[PDB]
Design a protein around this nucleic acid. Sequence first.
RNA 1: UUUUCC
Length: 199
Amino acid sequence: SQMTRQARRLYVGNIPFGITEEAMMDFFNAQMRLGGLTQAPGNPVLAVQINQDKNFAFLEFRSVDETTQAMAFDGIIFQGQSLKIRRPHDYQPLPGMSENPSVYVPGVVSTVVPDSAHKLFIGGLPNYLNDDQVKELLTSFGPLKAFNLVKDSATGLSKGYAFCEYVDINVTDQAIAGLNGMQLGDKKLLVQRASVGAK
RNA sequence: UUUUCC
Ligand code: NA
Ligand code: NA
Ligand code: NA
Ligand code: NA
């Protein structure tokens, strides 16, 4: 419908280079069904519009509720990349309709890493590591609540630093002990709570 | 080496 369109669309950032609108649609339609989020027969995603030069897509869904549920996919890995799923900036919650997803997608780690006591900074990462591989490095210590690898906005190349938050606050110091000061060729990892060196 | 339209 006309009034609900703003509540039926999502921004998806950090998309794989060269991805087609059809490949993106198939990915989300399958994940929605496999995750138990699809609320009827047929495809929940109606269309995808990609901006190739700017590296983002907008999904359009058939229903308000399926759009909300799909927010739970924020951080899902697609061709090595953490998809950044967000509301359009002009989105306004409707009356009687929920704002936040009610389901959890197993193994999907949010990209939203708020400043907090145990948010970690990881600097000095080799730039050839993609989001998936950096996430795996950190997951070795324990499950993550949130993670983002910082990329150049124009080229898509990793800038070699990331932020994360472990589910268990006590894993923070274990990751620091295991990674801080690790030498990788010309780089030396700096792993510390992000508050220590933030601007 | 402190997360990017209609
Ligand atoms: Na990117
Ligand atoms: Na389930
Ligand atoms: Na970009
Ligand atoms: Na930039």
